[PDB]
Amino acid sequence: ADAPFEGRKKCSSCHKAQAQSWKDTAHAKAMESLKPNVKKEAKQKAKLDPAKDYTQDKDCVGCHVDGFGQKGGYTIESPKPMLTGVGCESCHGPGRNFRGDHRKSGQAFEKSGKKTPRKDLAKKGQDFHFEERCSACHLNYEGSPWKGAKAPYTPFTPEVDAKYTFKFDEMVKEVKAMHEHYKLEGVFEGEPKFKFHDEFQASAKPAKKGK
Numbered sequence: 344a345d346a347p348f349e350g351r352k353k354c355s356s357c358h359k360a361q362a363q364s365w366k367d368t369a370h371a372k373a374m375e376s377l378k379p380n381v382k383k384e385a386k387q388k389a390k391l392d393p394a395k396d397y398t399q400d401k402d403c404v405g406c407h408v409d410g411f412g413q414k415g416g417y418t419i420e421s422p423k424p425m426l427t428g429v430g431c432e433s434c435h436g437p438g439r440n441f442r443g444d445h446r447k448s449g450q451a452f453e454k455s456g457k458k459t460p461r462k463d464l465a466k467k468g469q470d471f472h473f474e475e476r477c478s479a480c481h482l483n484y485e486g487s488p489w490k491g492a493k494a495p496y497t498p499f500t501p502e503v504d505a506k507y508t509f510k511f512d513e514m515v516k517e518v519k520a521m522h523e524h525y526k527l528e529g530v531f532e533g534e535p536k537f538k539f540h541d542e543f544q545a546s547a548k549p550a551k552k553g554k
């Protein structure tokens with residue numbers, strides 16, 4: 344019983360600093376790349392049509408939106424702006440079930456300092472590991488080292504250009520590709536905890552924008 348996707352809106356309303364930074368990332372602009380005449384040079388190199396409209400192409404949208412083919416996720420028939428672009432749930436997991444726990448646990452902490460185990464969030468679908476999710480978009484090509492690969496494949500592979508080589512441990516540390524990291528008070532605790540969480544929090548910026 345995995346959880347349904349719902350879109351970025353509620354996440355962004357509670358996490359304004361991360362949302363503001365995420366908006367400037369290539370992930371947030373992913374659907375723009377599928378539009379005609381955008382990234383013409385890159386498309387030519389990959390032997391795609393620079394003038395074609397790929398925004399409703401099922402061979403392309405799944406890696407440029409949230410939750411394609413998944414419950415509550417993006418559909419070409421009724422495409423939600425809040426699921427357009429690679430958004431919050433594409434990395435952190437579909438949020439319909441865990442988002443309410445962020446609200447309740449946040450209120451419990453503000454009122455009484457009570458912390459909540461991350462295990463409770465993982466049970467509700469939140470992802471604290473990320474690698475498989477990033478890989479399903481970035482390493483989904485024929486003969487890829489990632490064994491979950493299956494069509495449709497990304498046209499942007501190491502064969503096309505070495506700049507498309509993907510190494511999770513390196514790229515998850517590119518803030519300009521994730522979003523800047525801001526300091527957490529520590530409402531959630533324990534495992535499963537992302538392997539680089541303490542590192543990211545140790546150099547995180549202070550609560551910038553919102554509250």
Ligand code: HEM
Binds near residue numbers: 357450532
């Ligand atoms: C939308 C589904 C959504 C996402 C995505 C999201 C992510 C998120 C992360 C990654 C954390 C950190 C967890 C950890 O410590 O490992 C986090 C923490 C908090 N959130 Fe959140 N969050 C989403 C939605 C919401 C909503 C709608 C609210 C507000 C009602 C909210 C609140 C919080 C709070 C509070 C925390 C703890 C912050 C702290 O300082 O420790 N989130 N969220």
Ligand code: HEM
Binds near residue numbers: 372408
């Ligand atoms: C998982 C945490 C994850 C990582 C790590 C990751 C990295 C990453 C980088 C470094 C880029 C390049 C950014 C830039 O050049 O400015 C990038 C770009 C795209 N990604 Fe990604 N990405 C992660 C996760 C995901 C997921 C889950 C998907 C598919 C739903 C995905 C897709 C894309 C796409 C598409 C781009 C390009 C956007 C564009 O320019 O149109 N990524 N990612």
Ligand code: HEM
Binds near residue numbers: 381497
């Ligand atoms: C479908 C034919 C399709 C199109 C069209 C498309 C376009 C596209 C562009 C223009 C980019 C940016 C490349 C650049 O160098 O700036 C881009 C990037 C990524 N895509 Fe995409 N894409 C199409 C399909 C798919 C599919 C089916 C997947 C996932 C299986 C996918 C994934 C990605 C990823 C990952 C990137 C980022 C590459 C990087 O910069 O590292 N795309 N796409």
Ligand code: HEM
Binds near residue numbers: 526
């Ligand atoms: C979508 C706009 C979005 C939100 C909202 C969001 C929130 C969020 C929080 C609150 C954290 C913890 C504090 C911090 O700033 O580090 C957090 C951490 C990570 N995120 Fe995130 N995040 C949003 C989008 C995305 C996207 C699209 C990706 C993947 C390309 C991504 C990845 C990460 C990673 C990795 C971390 C570190 C996790 C940790 O330290 O526990 N986020 N995000």
